[PDB]
Curated annotation (Swiss-Prot), chain B:
EC number: 2.7.7.-, 3.1.-.-
Subunit structure as annotated in this protein's UniProt entry: Homotetramer. Interacts (via N-terminus) with the excisionase (via C-terminus). Part of the excision complex made of the integrase tetramer, IHF, Fis and Xis.
Function, in words: Integrase is necessary for integration of the phage into the host genome by site-specific recombination. In conjunction with excisionase, integrase is also necessary for excision of the prophage from the host genome.
Keyword Transferase recorded: yes
Residues of the full protein shown: 72 to 356 of 356
Protein name: Integrase
Species of origin: Escherichia phage lambda (Bacteriophage lambda)
Active-site residues, record numbering mapped to chain: R141, K164, H237, R240, H262
GO MF assignments: DNA binding; hydrolase activity; integrase activity; transferase activity
Domain Core-binding (CB): 3-84
Superkingdom classification of source: Viruses
Residue intervals passing through the bilayer: none
Any one GO biological process: viral genome integration into host DNA
DNA sequence: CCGTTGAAGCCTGCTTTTTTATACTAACTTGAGCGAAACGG
């Protein structure tokens, strides 16, 4: 079906759980009951999001089965899908500096990757894949991997809510870090995306904070960046920099989720 | 009684013959029907299962021809839908399957590549070079480029009647590509001196040429140049795609759309300050 | 300075007003087992 590598692994992770939670008996013999018995078994453990992906992947498995002469109906399209609200909190500006000072004990690239992920508002994965050759005439050509949307971030961008410049942070990664990638390690070599966030969680718990539910993360730097880019300049600006095009998430990525009250001014 | 699959496919072809469509179009469907003949046994429609339909479909998907599977699946489905209308069966066992999503793998053409092909077209006759520059200066399709007569040119214009869509436009004899070094006027007059016939693009015998030979000989100069690509080597039709790509950065985007013959709208965007 | 009268209060059946849809697609994030680099004897 032409997949993007990683996505394929996700499916296999959901299929390996079905064969372990459901007998290897005939498909036509598989009633709707035995499908909800296993499904609900993962809903009580708090894994509500898991039950949604398992039922969606298992349901599609039967649609293909019906197409190849195996079964007549899908007994998975009869069960309900478990809704799951986001428990991940949002990051604030006053919380950003706190983690900034708690990253002192941490390597140097962590204090630069955090400032570069809030000034450009780029994805973590596409943040560790940007070479110094992707910067021409003061423009940072970034090609996302998720959606695959290309953009150009001008070096003339700075946040007055944190006191950081993109031209000052960029050059601060050429001397301290030094490498083929804007964000390298202590060995002048690239760094995985599943490690840049790891070192960020350490300073989080060490900074001694306190949130409601699931604590923020490195990915939250993209949310805080857009939240500031919406009041600093405009809304049409923090909609293209993130690589977004639709007009449905421009209001969802603006929410607060119950962190800080939406202060309504005279305007 | 009178059932069976094949018996229906014979009474189905006549139905499409009265639909009132293009000639070449009707032929495309026929080639799909013949494939179904040697792809499925001769038995009543109510006996054909969804399994056998997907067994033949996927067989063409694995061979590499995923695109063909889509049309054959979309055509075979129409036959049954018209079969139910007559009262033959009750259900369409083809609407249960799923068409295989195919991605276009025909590489595009650049400016450097075109220059390498035009020069390699030396061994080729004296009408190919003219057909190349013309197909890029007009950005028209190979089908109409062969049906262009010198009578179409009226007071500095170029009346072109697209056969595919049917759009009617007039390309002025003042255009000029500023990237390859070609001029509409200088190109047309070059065809009146060298060629010399009733049609803008003729043969060495002063006679019109088919649209299947214009792109055929173009292929020879493609593999003779010695250029490597990624996927399937571009074709003569790509000159139309290269034409627009150039005019969009030479004049305007609204100009390329009007030149190609489009009406409605349907890479590295810039993030402005405001 | 005890006894009657009226602004409220819940039970039921309506009568509206704000949110979220369905689904592949593509990631992100905290374990834990594992191999190589770098410092202590």
């Amino acid at each position: 079906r032409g997949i993007k590598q990683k996505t394929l692994i996700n499916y296999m992770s959901k299929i390996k759980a079905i064969r372990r939670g459901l007998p290897d008996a005939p498909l036509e013999d598989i009633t709707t009951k035995e499908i909800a018995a296993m499904l609900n078994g993962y809903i009580d453990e708090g894994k509500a999001a898991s039950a949604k992906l398992i039922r969606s992947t298992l349901s599609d498995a039967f649609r293909e089965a019906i197409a190849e002469g195996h079964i007549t109906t899908n007994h998975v399209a009869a069960t309900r899908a478990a809704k799951s609200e986001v428990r991940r909190s949002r990051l604030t500006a006053d919380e950003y500096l706190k983690i900034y000072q708690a990253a002192e004990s941490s390597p140097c690239w962590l204090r630069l990757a955090m400032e570069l992920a809030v000034v450009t508002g780029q994805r973590v994965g596409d943040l560790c894949e940007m070479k110094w050759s992707d910067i021409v005439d003061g423009y940072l050509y970034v090609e996302q991997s998720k959606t695959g949307v290309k953009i150009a971030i001008p070096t003339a961008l700075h946040i007055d809510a944190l006191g950081i410049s993109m031209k000052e942070t960029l050059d601060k990664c050429k001397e301290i870090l030094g490498g083929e990638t804007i964000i390298a390690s202590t060995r002048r070599e690239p760094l995985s995306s599943g490690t840049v966030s790891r070192y960020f969680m350490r300073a989080r718990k060490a900074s001694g904070l306190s949130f409601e539910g699931d604590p923020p993360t490195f990915h939250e730097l993209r949310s805080l960046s857009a939240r500031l880019y919406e009041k600093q300049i405009s809304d049409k600006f923090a909609q293209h920099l993130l690589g977004h095009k639709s007009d449905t998430m421009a209001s969802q990525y603006r929410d607060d989720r119950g962190r800080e009250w939406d202060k309504i001014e005279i305007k | 009684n009178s059932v069976t699959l094949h018996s229906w496919l014979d009474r189905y072809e006549k139905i499409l013959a009265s639909r009132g469509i293009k000639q070449k179009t009707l032929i495309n469907y026929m080639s799909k029907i013949k494939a179904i003949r040697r792809g499925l046994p001769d038995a009543p429609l109510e006996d054909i299962t969804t399994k056998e339909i997907a067994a033949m479909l996927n067989g063409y998907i694995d061979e590499g021809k995923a695109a063909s599977a889509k049309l054959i699946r979309s055509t075979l489905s129409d036959a049954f839908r018209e079969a139910i209308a007559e009262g033959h069966i009750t259900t369409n066992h083809v609407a249960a399957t799923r068409a295989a999503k195919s991605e276009v793998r025909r590489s595009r053409l650049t400016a450097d590549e075109y220059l390498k092909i035009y020069q390699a077209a030396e061994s080729s006759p004296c009408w190919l070079r003219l057909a190349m520059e013309l197909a890029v200066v007009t950005g028209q399709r190979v089908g109409d480029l062969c049906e262009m007569k010198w009578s179409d040119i009226v007071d500095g214009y170029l009346y072109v009647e697209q056969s595919k869509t049917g759009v009617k436009i007039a390309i002025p004899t003042a255009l000029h590509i500023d990237a390859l070094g070609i001029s509409m006027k200088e190109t047309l007059d070059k065809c009146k001196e060298i060629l010399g016939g009733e049609t803008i693009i003729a043969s060495t015998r002063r006679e019109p040429l088919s649209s299947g030979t214009v792109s055929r000989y173009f292929m020879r100069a493609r593999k003779a140049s010695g250029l490597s690509f990624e996927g399937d080597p571009p074709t003569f039709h790509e000159l139309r795609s290269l034409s627009a790509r150039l005019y969009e950065k030479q004049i305007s985007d609204k100009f390329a759309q009007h030149l190609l013959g489009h009406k409605s709208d349907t890479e590295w965007d810039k993030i402005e300050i405001k």
